[PDB]
Amino acid sequence: MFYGTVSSPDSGVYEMKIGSIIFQVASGDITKEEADVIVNSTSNSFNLKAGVSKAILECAGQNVERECSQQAQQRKNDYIITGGGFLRCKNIIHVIGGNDVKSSVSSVLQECEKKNYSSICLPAIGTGNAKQHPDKVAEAIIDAIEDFVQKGSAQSVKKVKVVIFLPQVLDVFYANMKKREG
Ligand SMILES: CC(C)NC(=O)c1ccc2ccccc2n1
Numbered sequence: 496m497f498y499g500t501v502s503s504p505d506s507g508v509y510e511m512k513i514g515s516i517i518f519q520v521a522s523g524d525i526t527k528e529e530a531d532v533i534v535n536s537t538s539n540s541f542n543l544k545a546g547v548s549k550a551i552l553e554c555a556g557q558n559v560e561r562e563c564s565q566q567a568q569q570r571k572n573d574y575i576i577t578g579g580g581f582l583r584c585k586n587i588i589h590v591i592g593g594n595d596v597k598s599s600v601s602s603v604l605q606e607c608e609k610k611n612y613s614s615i616c617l618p619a620i621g622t623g624n625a626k627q628h629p630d631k632v633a634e635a636i637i638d639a640i641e642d643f644v645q646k647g648s649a650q651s652v653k654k655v656k657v658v659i660f661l662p663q664v665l666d667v668f669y670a671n672m673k674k675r676e677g
């Protein structure tokens with residue numbers, strides 16, 4: 496009902512349509528990307544500095560670190576939204592790596608529609624310190640996007656890209672795309 500064809504538009508990038516959204520995967524350093532929103536996969540304290548979270552907090556800078564710990568003490572949050580700091584984005588959405596990945600991605604998509612944003616870049620959420628299995632993480636990310644499209648919710652969001660630290664995890668995402676393709 497939804498899936499287009501898998502192709503490679505640029506070296507190391509793989510893409511397919513999911514309804515009106517372009518879904519892409521690539522390996523690399525997510526802190527070098529430009530998008531309306533970049534997603535961080537962190538702890539329930541929003542102060543982890545290991546793996547992807549280390550790179551994101553160090554690049555973003557100390558004002559973003561302090562925004563995080565200020566919101567964490569105010570209430571119990573499933574995720575938090577901060578400024579971009581010195582990353583090339585309008586906002587960072589910090590999700591909890593150990594939480595249900597489909598739920599986390601659904602929340603990111605909803606928040607981006609609320610701001611009329613068009614582009615999102617995320618890591619392989621949960622595959623770092625949280626040690627969720629890559630096969631289950633890929634299935635959950637793509638399922639969230641399918642559900643969002645099926646419900647008629649995609650209006651401003653046009654591009655969702657997963658930038659993945661390890662090439663071996665990229666292989667798992669590409670196999671999942673080929674399983675789904677029209
Ligand atoms: C070798 C291993 C311990 N490093 C990591 O897990 C890791 C993850 C994401 C990164 C993003 C930018 C830069 C370095 C990064 N390193």
Ligand SMILES: [Cl-]
Nearest residue numbers: 592621623625
């Ligand atoms: Cl994680």
Ligand SMILES: [Cl-]
Nearest residue numbers: 618619659660
């Ligand atoms: Cl990753």
